[PDB]
Amino acid sequence: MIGLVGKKVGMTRIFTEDGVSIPVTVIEVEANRVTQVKDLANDGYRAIQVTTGAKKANRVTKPEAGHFAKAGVEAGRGLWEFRLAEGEEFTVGQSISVELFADVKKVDVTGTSKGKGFAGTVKRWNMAGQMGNERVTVQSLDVVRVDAERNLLLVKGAVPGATGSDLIVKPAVKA
């Protein structure tokens, strides 16, 4: 329905409620302000593009400052698109957190991987290319901790995100 964009704080094996060390990911949940909403008439489709974080004005150039002023929100780390559920429409300016995500336990995660240089053929194929640093589509994950006070989203297993790299979490429909 609506996704979130954040960063990978860490990935460790935390004790379960029963008291068993289980792999779990540490993902921060930053309040993603709504910047622009698309419509099927003006642009041909309806979807919401949001922003996360807050970057200094030095990096942001003045045309982007005007774009964000149109959006009515401060400039952040960037813009991330999210498909609308084809039903209710949100409003520009508000921000969302994990909130209702604790109702599916099938949320998907997207992100990058380790920074890995162009590797040799022998070590990568056993024909020179790159591995990692690509968008990941691991799916069918289960949420573990949904504590919104800490603004941290925890899911089962590992997360496809490098240290300090951006990532997205969406209410998947696959399994």
């Binding site: 380790k114 920074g115 890995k116 240089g117």
Partner: protein, 120 residues
């Protein structure tokens, strides 16, 4: 590999590179200013700043460690007595590097490394 690594490789023998670092640091501290290429200049600064920072504390163990890493009686004797009090107020960044174009012989970039005070 190639990610989150500190210290340029400077492909050489480990003992040889350690000896070269020690000799270069000794020469620079003796002359108070050296001309070295930027790739080696940054490593020189990184490996020499710890010694001058440790020189602030004067103790038998500190002097023994300084002599162990320096192996020069005069260099140890002049240390812990002059550089310490000179940069007592300053905490870090005791040296500065300024680029000086490139060497004509082998197009090798060069840079002057010298103490920030540089005199007095």
């Amino acid at each position: 590999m190639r990610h989150r690594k500190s210290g340029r490789q400077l492909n050489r023998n480990s003992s040889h590179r350690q000896a070269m670092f020690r000799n270069m640091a000794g020469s620079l501290v003796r002359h108070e200013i050296i001309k070295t290429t930027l790739p080696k200049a940054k490593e020189l600064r990184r490996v020499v700043e710890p010694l001058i920072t440790l020189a602030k504390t004067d103790s038998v163990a500190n002097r023994r460690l300084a002599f162990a890493r320096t192996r020069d009686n005069e260099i140890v004797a002049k240390l812990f007595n002059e550089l310490g009090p000179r940069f007592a107020s300053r905490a870090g960044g005791y040296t500065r590097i300024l680029k000086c174009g490139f060497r004509a012989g082998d197009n090798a970039p060069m840079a002057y490394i010298e103490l920030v005070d540089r005199s007095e």
